[PDB]
Design a protein that fits this description.
The structure is a homodimer. The first copy, chain A, has 230 residues and is α/β, with parallel strands linked by helices. The first copy, chain A, is built from seven helices and eleven strands. The PDB classes it as hydrolase.
Chain lengths: 230, 235
């Protein structure tokens, strides 16, 4: 019963920031206009800059964006929001700030009660039960890896198994397989750049032109393509 | 500009050079730093996909020709007494989060740090190099378990980013390594991050932390362009 748009990344090569997300958002808004933006993953730009940028790209869709860090009452802003938008950046800082401010549970409940959730990269991580499949660096301790638990599977965004020539460090699949040792019940979706999962009207729909990979404990990786229903 | 470092550390970026055997490039470094030491305790907890017995036996086998006797801390009767009596503490690669989680849960983190401060040789590669730093905030590993705190052994005062490379797959739009490091420098602007490439190491001996290995090392500090360093540099 939830409405989610989970993008692997913000920008296709040669396209504008979030350009490819606009028609997917447009199709899912279903009349919604009031959005709260969660900027906390952003580290190297200010949250005001991040919010203005998000407001700018969504304005032609009719969406009104409010940055949650600039309202007096963030709980009431989330409560009245029709759309919750969670930007990319560092996943640990995103989760840490969301938990410290007491926003994690209100965000999840607002989405469960009907609000549209849009997240890309780090914001796709946050929608999963935990952030255990992020690729980000642990620059801050989020005091727990549990996240919004809006999508039941673990998404690994920016998925690629390519490595630089001669690299001897862990491959992406090797890192995921280690997670499957410690948490053997999990399904990990290797969601490549360019792809997304859109949960709407009772269906979780894989989208994007690139091959998606599913990892489960003890099973060879499974290739999926756009149109798969989870 | 580090002051005198009183610990004996060997911090390897990685275990295996291309075309070489596991730890092959480390053997002359270990041998020449042993300084008469023979008794080693191996910390296997980073290993996920191999058993800690297998990991320990592999480590014991490869170091036995150096005269080093290896026991795995997970199978000794008394892990606190084993650390106290160890001449060498060896921390293997694997998942850094699990390594730190197990070390903390078992109450070994402080005894390991204290034994090294009191004279023991510390050898770590990859995850074991991360663990020697004040925190694991510069690991490249995936957070597969929560270690209940990112503070680590604090034996080496600077942050090591092992396996350092700024190269990315064709067309990739995700964060570059330097960008991930620059974000850490926003939240912790006092830090020095050493981009330690594969093949390289940091050896702390006779009071000096000396860079080793044939590849270029890059140092990142807040608001400063990356600095290129080569073998022989003293931190």
């Amino acid at each position: 019963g939830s409405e989610l748009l989970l993008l692997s990344n913000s920008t296709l090569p040669g396209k504008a920031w979030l350009e490819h997300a606009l028609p997917l958002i447009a199709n899912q808004l279903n009349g919604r206009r009031s959005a709260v933006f969660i900027p906390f993953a952003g580290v190297t730009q200010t949250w005001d800059e991040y919010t203005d940028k998000t407001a700018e790209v969504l304005a032609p869709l009719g969406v009104n964006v409010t940055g949650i860090h600039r309202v007096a009452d963030p709980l009431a802003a989330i409560e009245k929001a029709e759309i919750i938008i969670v930007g990319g950046g560092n996943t640990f800082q995103l989760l840490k700030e969301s938990r410290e401010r007491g926003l994690l549970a209100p965000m999840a409940d607002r989405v469960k009660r009907g609000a549209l959730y849009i997240g890309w990269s780090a914001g796709a991580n946050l929608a999963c039960p935990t952030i255990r499949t992020t690729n980000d660096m642990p620059i801050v301790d989020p005091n727990g890896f549990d996240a919004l638990d809006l999508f039941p599977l673990q998404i690994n965004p920016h998925f690629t198994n390519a490595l630089p020539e001669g690299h001897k460090g862990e491959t992406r699949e090797q890192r995921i397989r280690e997670l499957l040792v410690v948490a053997p019940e999990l399904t990990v979706i290797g969601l490549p750049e360019g792809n997304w999962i859109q949960v709407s009207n009772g269906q979780a729909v894989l989208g994007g032109p690139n091959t998606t990979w599913v990892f489960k404990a003890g099973e060879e990786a499974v290739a999926l393509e756009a149109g798969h229903r989870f």
